[PDB]
Write an enzyme that holds these catalytic residues in place. Structure first.
Site, short mmCIF file in Angstrom:
data_model
loop_
_atom_site.label_atom_id
_atom_site.label_comp_id
_atom_site.label_asym_id
_atom_site.label_seq_id
_atom_site.Cartn_x
_atom_site.Cartn_y
_atom_site.Cartn_z
CD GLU A 35 -3.11 -0.62 0.04
OE1 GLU A 35 -3.09 0.50 -0.52
OE2 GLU A 35 -3.91 -1.50 -0.26
CG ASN A 46 -8.09 7.25 -5.22
OD1 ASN A 46 -7.27 6.48 -5.78
ND2 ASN A 46 -8.21 7.33 -3.92
CG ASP A 48 -13.47 8.58 -5.50
OD1 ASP A 48 -12.38 9.12 -5.19
OD2 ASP A 48 -13.95 7.68 -4.77
CB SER A 50 -11.53 9.58 -2.36
OG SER A 50 -10.94 8.53 -3.10
CG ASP A 52 -6.38 5.85 -1.33
OD1 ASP A 52 -7.53 5.69 -0.87
OD2 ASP A 52 -6.11 5.65 -2.52
CG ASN A 59 -11.02 6.23 -0.12
OD1 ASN A 59 -12.21 6.53 -0.10
ND2 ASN A 59 -10.22 6.49 -1.16
CG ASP A 101 -16.36 -2.59 6.38
OD1 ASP A 101 -15.27 -2.92 5.86
OD2 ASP A 101 -17.36 -2.20 5.72
#
Length: 129
Positions: A35, A46, A48, A50, A52, A59, A101
Protein backbone atom coordinates in the site's frame (compact mmCIF):
# COMPACT_ATOMS: atom_id res chain seq x y z
CA UNK A 1 8.80 8.63 8.50
CA UNK A 2 9.44 5.49 6.54
CA UNK A 3 9.34 2.43 8.77
CA UNK A 4 11.67 -0.51 8.39
CA UNK A 5 9.87 -3.78 7.91
CA UNK A 6 10.74 -5.22 11.34
CA UNK A 7 10.23 -1.87 13.12
CA UNK A 8 6.72 -1.78 11.70
CA UNK A 9 6.06 -5.38 12.59
CA UNK A 10 6.91 -4.59 16.20
CA UNK A 11 4.68 -1.48 16.21
CA UNK A 12 1.75 -3.35 14.68
CA UNK A 13 2.19 -6.12 17.26
CA UNK A 14 2.22 -3.60 20.09
CA UNK A 15 -0.99 -2.10 18.73
CA UNK A 16 -2.81 -5.43 18.70
CA UNK A 17 -2.85 -6.35 15.00
CA UNK A 18 -1.35 -9.85 15.32
CA UNK A 19 -4.33 -12.07 14.60
CA UNK A 20 -6.78 -9.20 14.66
CA UNK A 21 -9.90 -10.65 13.00
CA UNK A 22 -7.93 -13.74 12.19
CA UNK A 23 -5.15 -12.05 10.24
CA UNK A 24 -1.58 -12.79 11.28
CA UNK A 25 0.98 -10.05 11.73
CA UNK A 26 2.66 -10.76 8.38
CA UNK A 27 -0.54 -9.92 6.51
CA UNK A 28 -0.62 -6.43 8.07
CA UNK A 29 3.09 -5.82 7.35
CA UNK A 30 2.68 -7.10 3.78
CA UNK A 31 -0.37 -4.81 3.29
CA UNK A 32 1.61 -1.78 4.46
CA UNK A 33 4.56 -2.71 2.18
CA UNK A 34 2.47 -2.77 -0.95
CA UNK A 35 0.00 0.00 0.00
CA UNK A 36 2.57 2.64 1.09
CA UNK A 37 6.07 1.11 0.96
CA UNK A 38 6.02 1.56 4.75
CA UNK A 39 5.69 5.33 4.24
CA UNK A 40 3.62 7.07 6.91
CA UNK A 41 3.33 10.26 4.80
CA UNK A 42 2.25 8.70 1.45
CA UNK A 43 -0.87 10.10 -0.23
CA UNK A 44 -2.59 9.08 -3.45
CA UNK A 45 -5.31 10.98 -5.27
CA UNK A 46 -8.20 9.09 -6.93
CA UNK A 47 -10.52 9.84 -9.87
CA UNK A 48 -13.52 10.20 -7.51
CA UNK A 49 -11.92 13.08 -5.60
CA UNK A 50 -10.92 10.93 -2.66
CA UNK A 51 -7.38 10.53 -1.39
CA UNK A 52 -5.70 7.61 0.34
CA UNK A 53 -3.67 8.49 3.40
CA UNK A 54 -0.70 7.11 5.22
CA UNK A 55 0.84 3.75 6.01
CA UNK A 56 -2.30 1.75 5.21
CA UNK A 57 -3.69 4.12 2.50
CA UNK A 58 -6.99 4.76 4.19
CA UNK A 59 -9.58 6.40 1.93
CA UNK A 60 -11.25 9.76 2.47
CA UNK A 61 -14.61 8.83 0.93
CA UNK A 62 -15.48 6.05 3.34
CA UNK A 63 -13.14 6.25 6.34
CA UNK A 64 -11.51 9.58 7.23
CA UNK A 65 -12.45 13.22 6.70
CA UNK A 66 -10.34 15.58 4.58
CA UNK A 67 -13.08 18.07 3.78
CA UNK A 68 -12.47 17.96 0.01
CA UNK A 69 -13.93 14.53 -0.86
CA UNK A 70 -17.44 14.21 -2.31
CA UNK A 71 -19.79 11.68 -0.70
CA UNK A 72 -17.60 11.40 2.37
CA UNK A 73 -18.85 9.20 5.24
CA UNK A 74 -16.05 9.43 7.85
CA UNK A 75 -16.70 5.92 9.18
CA UNK A 76 -13.54 5.92 11.33
CA UNK A 77 -14.54 9.33 12.72
CA UNK A 78 -11.11 10.77 12.29
CA UNK A 79 -9.48 13.53 10.27
CA UNK A 80 -7.30 12.12 7.47
CA UNK A 81 -4.45 14.31 8.80
CA UNK A 82 -4.26 11.97 11.90
CA UNK A 83 -3.46 9.14 9.49
CA UNK A 84 -0.28 10.99 8.45
CA UNK A 85 1.50 10.62 11.81
CA UNK A 86 4.83 8.92 12.50
CA UNK A 87 2.75 7.33 15.33
CA UNK A 88 0.62 4.58 13.70
CA UNK A 89 -2.05 4.56 16.49
CA UNK A 90 -4.78 6.27 14.48
CA UNK A 91 -4.17 4.25 11.32
CA UNK A 92 -4.31 1.06 13.38
CA UNK A 93 -7.53 2.07 15.10
CA UNK A 94 -9.15 2.84 11.74
CA UNK A 95 -7.76 -0.35 10.17
CA UNK A 96 -9.43 -2.42 12.89
CA UNK A 97 -12.76 -0.80 12.02
CA UNK A 98 -12.19 -1.37 8.26
CA UNK A 99 -11.33 -5.07 8.66
CA UNK A 100 -14.29 -5.63 10.95
CA UNK A 101 -16.74 -3.95 8.53
CA UNK A 102 -17.41 -7.09 6.37
CA UNK A 103 -14.66 -7.47 3.78
CA UNK A 104 -11.75 -8.53 6.00
CA UNK A 105 -8.43 -7.51 4.50
CA UNK A 106 -9.89 -7.59 0.95
CA UNK A 107 -10.54 -3.92 1.75
CA UNK A 108 -6.85 -3.25 0.91
CA UNK A 109 -6.33 -3.66 -2.89
CA UNK A 110 -2.59 -4.08 -2.48
CA UNK A 111 -3.13 -6.87 0.09
CA UNK A 112 -5.49 -8.87 -2.09
CA UNK A 113 -3.23 -8.39 -5.12
CA UNK A 114 0.17 -9.03 -3.53
CA UNK A 115 -0.24 -10.67 -0.13
CA UNK A 116 -3.34 -12.89 -0.11
CA UNK A 117 -2.38 -16.50 -0.64
CA UNK A 118 1.37 -15.83 -0.34
CA UNK A 119 3.85 -16.71 2.38
CA UNK A 120 3.05 -13.65 4.46
CA UNK A 121 5.16 -14.88 7.33
CA UNK A 122 8.19 -13.88 5.25
CA UNK A 123 7.37 -10.31 6.20
CA UNK A 124 8.15 -10.99 9.89
CA UNK A 125 11.04 -13.41 9.44
CA UNK A 126 14.35 -12.09 10.70
CA UNK A 127 12.57 -9.66 13.11
CA UNK A 128 12.94 -9.52 16.88
CA UNK A 129 9.30 -9.49 18.01
Amino acid sequence: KVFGRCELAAAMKRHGLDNYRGYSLGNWVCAAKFESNFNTQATNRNTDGSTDYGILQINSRWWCNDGRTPGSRNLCNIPCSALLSSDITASVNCAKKIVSDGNGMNAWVAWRNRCKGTDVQAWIRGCRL
